[PDB]
């Protein structure tokens, strides 16, 4: 019933984050206790035996096996190789019936997506990085899935739209900015969603005396902006084109593929998994030559 407070700005500005202490302990325990333990590494020699491996070309055979154990733990349950594979023939991309193993097709794309996130969007995920667990939480469906609805849905800021600014960078009115008050309402709706997705308030990213200011805002605002650019890449190039792959039970009413948003990783916390650092333990997923100076164990 006590309130925890974190100061995030200068004295007396009231740039502060408030947390109900009992609720936060509960949410935190419900992450730590289910947090999956990682198997330890190895370093064997030799050339690769694989028949139909297309992304994980660059890691040892032991690292590959350890990765597959992690993926099943993170998406399907600790032993559930049958979720993706014809267990009689791991190289298959089809069932014995000939029908495609769509989960394996998706998982191959999810590997490329995760390497793209960790490699190209280090300005967002830094050295925490993401793994399959960050979205999936041990389950096939992440949180925060969204589909086409109406034209003015603000979640399309994370897909095809660009531009949320409404404030004028000058004293006098000009033709440079003709933003409506309705557009300020739309940005305000978008920004409530981001605040809720992280379990923070507006002062985490702004000094609300001037929402346009970057100098007065905490550095987290710059990280947040890279999160928008990352989601546009993730949605447009990886999640949305999987439309022909899924069964129709996964698709929206418009027949579109499920798309991600801030809450999909963050799940209401200021960092995903309260900043648990798992990606450093799984070189298969880095998309980098080194993780925090630790070099990639190539082949």
């Amino acid at each position: 019933a006590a309130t925890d407070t974190v100061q995030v700005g200068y004295r007396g500005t009231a740039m502060e984050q408030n947390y109900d202490h009992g609720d936060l302990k509960t949410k935190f325990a419900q992450v730590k206790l289910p947090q999956s333990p990682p198997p330890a590494g190895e370093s064997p020699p030799g050339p690769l035996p694989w028949k139909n491996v297309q992304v994980l070309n660059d890691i040892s055979i032991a690292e590959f096996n350890r990765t597959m154990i992690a993926m099943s733990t993170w998406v399907a349950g600790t032993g559930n190789c049958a979720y993706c594979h014809n267990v009689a023939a791991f190289q298959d991309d089809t069932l014995p019936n000939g029908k495609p193993l769509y989960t394996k097709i998706v998982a191959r794309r999810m590997l490329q997506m995760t390497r793209n996130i960790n490699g190209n969007y280090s300005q967002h995920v830094k050295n925490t990085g993401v793994t399959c667990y960050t979205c999936h939480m041990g389950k096939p469906l992440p949180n925060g899935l969204w589909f086409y609805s109406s034209q003015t849905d603000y979640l399309r800021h994370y897909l095809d739209r660009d531009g949320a600014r409404v404030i004028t960078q000058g004293v006098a009115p000009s033709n440079a900015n003709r933003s409506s008050t309705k557009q300020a309402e739309w940005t305000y709706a978008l920004m409530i969603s981001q605040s809720r997705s992280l379990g923070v308030n507006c002062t985490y990213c702004h000094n609300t005396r001037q929402f346009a200011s970057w100098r007065e805002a905490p550095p987290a605002r710059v990280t947040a902006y890279h999160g928008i650019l990352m989601l546009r890449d993730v949605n447009q190039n990886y999640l949305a084109p999987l439309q022909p792959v899924y069964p129709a039970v996964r698709l929206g009413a418009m027949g579109d593929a499920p798309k991600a948003q801030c809450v999909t990783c963050h799940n209401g916390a200021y960092k995903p998994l309260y900043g648990a650092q798992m990606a450093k333990d799984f070189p298969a997923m880095w998309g980098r030559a080194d993780w925090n100076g630790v070099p990639f164990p190539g082949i």
């Binding site: 006590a2 309130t3 407070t5 100061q7 700005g9 200068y10 004295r11 007396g12 500005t13 009231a14 740039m15 502060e16 984050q17 408030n18 947390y19 109900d20 409530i192 605040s195 809720r196 308030n201 507006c202 002062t203 702004h206 000094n207 609300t208 005396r209």
Partner: protein, 273 residues
């Protein structure tokens, strides 16, 4: 100097503490023991404000900003340049405001008046004490108080509001605003009625209680009466400050989510869940 009828009223008595020792006037002002303590706290607090301005970046009146300490200091007295000066000024303010209310009680007692004015002013002191004492104490740091600066405290109000994403949805804030707006309407209405009977159009007799009663009944559909409108004005003005004190003390100590999602209880009433 004295009003042409005043001298008759300047008797001893009605003091609370000092007896006859401070029971005197200085120009128009009554002194008394709480006059002495008032001027002490006013002078100390003002000079420490001027010192806070002097060690700050500018003398521009609008930009002066004596800020509270960082939250890390908790309920301790911080270093003076780090916000301990704000804490001393806050004690001086409480001393001044309390002394002012008690001095008003001595003046009312000396004139044979009821204590309505001291108690009405207590509604403002309650709201101030909630902002700088009670809510910071419940949050566990004096650093939650508002800064002393003509515009820098508006930056604080802005950022506190957005700590709850959409502060307009605070239900006690909606009531407090309604009291403030209704008070201002009621003040315009009462002020206009008294003036318009006492200042009728040129060449017209001075109006009567009956005329303002007739007109007021046409405005609201009931007659409030002469004492009733003053009870109403006091109720609205003081109720506004009391609901203001409630609306800020529930924000943080008791509610910590966005204010819009507080309304989830209304959407889930079982008649329509």
């Amino acid at each position: 100097a004295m009003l042409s009828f005043e001298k008759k009223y300047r008797v001893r008595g009605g003091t609370l503490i000092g007896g006859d020792l401070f029971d005197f006037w200085f120009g128009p002002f009554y002194v008394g023991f709480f006059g002495v303590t008032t001027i002490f706290f006013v002078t100390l607090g003002t000079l420490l404000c001027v010192w806070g301005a002097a060690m700050g970046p500018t003398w521009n009146l609008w930009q002066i900003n004596i800020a509270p300490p960082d939250l890390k200091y908790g309920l301790g007295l911080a270093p003076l340049r780090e916000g301990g000066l704000w804490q001393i000024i806050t004690l001086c303010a409480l001393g001044a405001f309390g002394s002012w209310a008690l001095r008003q009680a001595e003046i009312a007692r000396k004139l044979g008046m009821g204590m309505h004015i001291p108690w009405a002013y207590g509604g403002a002191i309650l709201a101030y004490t909630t902002l700088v004492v009670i809510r910071p104490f419940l949050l566990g740091a004096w650093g939650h108080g508002f800064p002393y600066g003509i515009f820098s405290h508006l930056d604080w109000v802005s950022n506190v509001g957005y700590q709850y994403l959409h502060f307009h949805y605070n239900p006690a804030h909606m009531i407090a605003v309604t009291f403030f707006f209704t008070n201002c309407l009621a003040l315009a209405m009462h002020g206009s009625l008294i003036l318009s009977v006492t200042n009728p159009p040129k060449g017209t007799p001075t109006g009567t209680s009956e005329q303002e009663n007739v007109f007021f009944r046409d405005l609201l559909g009931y007659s409030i009466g002469a004492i009733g409108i003053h009870r109403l004005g006091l109720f609205l003005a003081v109720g506004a400050a009391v609901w203001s004190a409630i609306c800020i003390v529930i924000s943080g100590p008791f509610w910590t989510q966005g204010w819009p999602e507080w309304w989830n209880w209304w959407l889930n009433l079982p008649i329509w869940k």
